[PDB]
Design a protein around this ligand. Structure first.
Ligand SMILES: O=C(O)c1[nH]c(=O)[nH]c(=O)c1F
Ligand SMILES: O=C(O)c1[nH]c(=O)[nH]c(=O)c1F
Ligand SMILES: [Zn+2]
Ligand SMILES: [Zn+2]
Ligand SMILES: [Zn+2]
Ligand SMILES: [Zn+2]
Lengths: 362, 362
């Protein structure tokens, strides 16, 4: 007996096109998405060139429209130079992403005053999300209150962070957050197995106490999002390993295993992979779209999942219960039992749908 | 310049058919809904006969399918005799409604043990909502924790109640709630104008401090819902006035006025009249459905709105800014500038849509 789920949404993926297509491209990454039961993705802007101006966004839109197999929205990225320049294209993006900790030079902000400038100039009705670790969570929350608007915290990974967000919500502050599967299912205990290269990720893997705190505070977690961050094994095992894990193909099997174990309910999962992503990012419904899963099938994650060009996974060897059997996207069979059946280019930019525009006052 | 909104959802209406059709019927009440920018309603079960068994639900479904002009789901009602008997029809209903304070004999529960029995036997994946005032909020929350499931509190009307819910959410308990417009825009101060008959409503009108507490704690309010409770003027002004206000045609104009005044944002409104209703009750999207509003037009609420058979309103004389200009429902023009253009029977039972079934484990 298969269970029908709505089309799931991952609001945090890195699809590496343009400029890193040996790691992933729209076609391979959205294949990975569909195989993971994900029918809509929001793609981060730290590509090469990064999506920090209108020409780069225009290029990325065409690459995505030609390569994506599932539907998508594209983030714009904040830079030290583009505050106040994005007004005409802001509504066409998923939102604005701030890299407030480590990143490459083009996305680095050197002063909290630059964060303030972005919060002040980005249209107030559109989403802002932040990579903000440890005290940076408190700092960006302060900037949000000074400018009287909301903020969404990406990949919350620590007891410290979820408890700060919990306190902020108790005071009625408009903050939401997401958690990635590696911060719920991996910890320091796994670093010996993974090694120092494979294990590199930002936010880093937490302690067992961090993991337990995120589970205990599930009510504070608005979304799950993979932070699909593909790099090849050569790169992860080399002399300057880049941080990040691929995760699209493993995130739903891991969470379905947790559901089967009673760690959270099926509704808890669907709030965090469907309803709350929709409502935080104003993402439109997908007509005739659904995912059929088998909650009985037991399997062991292999050394690499079939589709991501990363060709490795930190979850190798984990026993899971739950698998994606079939995905229907806008009335076409998109995935069955390991076979992707929609071509590159089938996916669409949801921000161009009339129902995908963010409502605003005139 | 008109603003396009998604199709709004009111999860708490009384449409009085069967058995009170001089007060309202599916056709007139859903006309009122469309004129208020509402494209989907959840209808309460305290009709005559009340919707407390499978035959009554079957009758109500046909009456709604023949009379409704917008889409709908129908609540089942808890009784002293039907716990453990609703399993085969539960998934076809909006949810289960508990009347825990005043109601008529057929829906009265005489013991908290009967509440426990309903929480124990109603399928755990389906919604339960409660009329639960003052300490009854705490009592039903206790029953929800004893049975390890969620509950939704209807029309929260008091500082006492919203602060108790706030405390429950801070402890991570699965509770949501709704607030009706009369508890945000009317108070004790209005009882002299309204008189003792018109002013009868349950929950009663609150103090200015109650109203201010609900606004201050907007972050705790998950949904707005009208509690559209129509009775004729003759009945409201008679010797045994029934409690309740009509509200479908006034609720969005009132809240749009608040948005124009800066009391809450347009997003705050759409979370509470669209996204959160969807996700709490697992209600499906409506394809090709949207509402165009004019946020500039100033007008004064008259002595009766055009469509509700109640033919009166407690908001008479309130100055509002904001009006519904056009409603499109599933690709047909449903309402323009005071004219309803879809016939009785156009509306459908969303629980019969494949996307409208509540996901559950096998
Ligand atoms: O793009 C990446 O690889 C990446 N990887 C990470 O582990 N963290 C990031 O914040 C990031 F942008
Ligand atoms: O149906 C009604 O009129 C009604 N009216 C109210 O004012 N409160 C109720 O709880 C109710 F069921
Ligand atoms: Zn990041
Ligand atoms: Zn990332
Ligand atoms: Zn009630
Ligand atoms: Zn009611």
């Amino acid at each position: 007996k298969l269970v029908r789920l709505p089309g799931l949404i991952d609001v945090h993926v890195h699809l590496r096109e343009p400029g890193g297509t040996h790691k992933e491209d729209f076609a391979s990454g959205t294949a990975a998405a569909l195989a993971g039961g994900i029918t809509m993705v929001c793609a981060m802007p730290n590509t090469r060139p990064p999506i920090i101006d209108a020409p780069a966004l225009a290029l990325a839109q065409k690459l995505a429209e030609a390569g994506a197999r599932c539907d998508f929205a594209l983030f714009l990225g904040a830079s030290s130079e583009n505050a106040g320049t994005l007004g005409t294209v802001a509504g066409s993006a998923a939102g604005l992403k701030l890299y407030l900790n480590e990143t490459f030079s083009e996305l680095r902000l050197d002063s909290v005053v630059q964060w303030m400038e972005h919060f002040e100039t980005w249209p107030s009705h559109l989403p802002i999300v932040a990579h903000a670790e440890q005290q940076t969570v408190a700092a960006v929350l302060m900037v949000a209150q000074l400018t009287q608007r909301s903020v969404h915290i990406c990949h919350v990974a620590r007891k410290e962070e979820i408890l700060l967000i919990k306190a902020a919500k108790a005071r009625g502050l408009p903050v939401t957050c997401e958690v990635a599967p590696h911060h719920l299912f991996l910890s320091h205990d796994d670093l010996e197995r993974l090694g120092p290269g494979k294990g590199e990720v930002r936010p880093e893997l937490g302690s067992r106490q961090d993991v337990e705190a995120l589970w205990e505070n599930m009510a504070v977690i608005d979304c799950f999002a993979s932070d699909h961050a593909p790099h090849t094994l050569e790169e992860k095992c080399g002399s300057r390993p880049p941080p990040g894990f691929p995760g699209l193909e493993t995130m739903l099997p891991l969470l379905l295993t947790a559901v089967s174990e009673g760690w959270l309910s099926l509704d808890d999962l669907l709030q965090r992979l469907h309803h709350n992503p929709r409502r935080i990012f104003h993402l439109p419904p997908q007509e005739d779209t659904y995912v059929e899963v088998d909650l009985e099938h037991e399997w062991t994650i292999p050394s690499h999942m079939p589709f991501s060009k990363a060709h490795w996974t930190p979850f190798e060897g984990q026993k899971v219960k739950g698998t994606v059997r079939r995905v229907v996207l806008r009335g076409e069979v998109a995935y069955i039992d390991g076979q992707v059946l929609v071509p590159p280019g089938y996916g669409q930019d949801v921000r161009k749908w009339p129902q995908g525009a963010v409502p605003q006052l005139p």
